[PDB]
Ligand binder design. Structure first.
Ligand SMILES: *[B@@]1([O])OC2=C(C([O])=O)[C]=[C][C]=C2[C][C]1[N]C(=O)[C][C]1[C][C][C]([N][C][C][N])[C][C]1
Length: 264
């Protein structure tokens, strides 16, 4: 019951002093549950999905690109870089940097990949090329996570991100090999156990990318793969009014459960 689910999302939002942006889409029927679907939210590290999709797209035209070694420096290292800091001095391949940024939310890896592509504007241009007129990447890590009230930098809408996740992981925005690699990376994410993954039935597989930012911002985007039915896209953006808010996992899990029940 889409209308019942949307009411429950409104009730969930009433429990905290912030905003919930949500879209769930059953890709077979197009059944769609949304809350604040056309409002902008700070996407934080969920942008790393669009970044790596852009890298994969480049690799379709440069066969050796994913195996190229990037010999980055200690001076490139910034906070929340659990893979790149361990391997500095040996370097990492482009594929390994994508895996790190997607599965561990590695910030240095994202900056290296942004630089490889030519800057944050190339990620925005990639989004436009797949039909997303809304996503905008304005800054690099870590400043893209400031999540300031009313700031449109480094934002998208839940609706635009739902369409982009659909086209990238389920549809044909990427070639088959690139779609499979993006899925494989996101299926292996390590940072989302308490978010979308905590709100779905035990037999659903999940490909997701989380984000956490200032103003208690807590996001998760991805696709659930139930057995014997089509994939379901889940987009969850949350951001709080208190600059001193502590980011939570439980609102995302609760919003996910609402939609999972509706799509039972
Ligand atoms: B990013 O948004 O992804 C990310 C997550 C995530 O995937 O949920 C968790 C932890 C770090 C990161 C890196 C990216 N975010 C930031 O760099 C901003 C940073 C995240 C940690 C917060 N810590 C507050 C005090 N416990 C503050 C902002």
């Amino acid at each position: 019951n889409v209308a019942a689910a949307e009411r429950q999302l409104r009730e969930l939002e009433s429990t905290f002093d912030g905003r919930l942006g949500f879209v769930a889409l059953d890709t077979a029927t197009g059944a769609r549950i949304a809350h604040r679907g056309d409002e902008r939210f700070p996407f934080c590290s969920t942008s790393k999905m669009m970044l790596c999709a852009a890298v994969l797209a480049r690799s379709a035209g440069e066969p050796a690109l994913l195996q190229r070694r990037i010999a980055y420096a200690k001076g490139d290292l910034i906070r929340y870089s659990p893979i790149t800091e361990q391997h500095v001095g040996a370097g990492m391949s482009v594929a390994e940097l994508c895996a790190a940024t997607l599965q561990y939310s590695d910030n240095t890896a994202a900056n290296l990949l942004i630089a490889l592509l030519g800057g944050p504007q190339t990620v925005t241009a990639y989004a436009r090329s797949i039909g997303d007129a809304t996503f905008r990447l304005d800054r690099r890590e870590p400043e893209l996570n400031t999540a300031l009230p009313g700031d449109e930098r480094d934002t998208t809408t839940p609706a635009a991100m739902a369409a982009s996740v659909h086209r990238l992981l389920v549809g044909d925005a990427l070639g088959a090999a690139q779609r499979a690699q993006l899925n494989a990376w996101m299926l292996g994410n390590k940072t989302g156990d308490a978010r979308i993954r905590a709100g779905v039935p035990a037999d659903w597989r999940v490909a997701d990318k989380t984000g956490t930012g200032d103003y208690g911002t807590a996001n998760d985007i991805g696709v659930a793969y139930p057995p014997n039915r089509a994939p379901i896209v889940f987009i969850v953006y949350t951001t709080m009014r208190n600059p001193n808010a502590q980011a939570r996992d439980d609102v995302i899990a609760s919003a996910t459960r609402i939609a999972a029940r509706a799509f039972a």
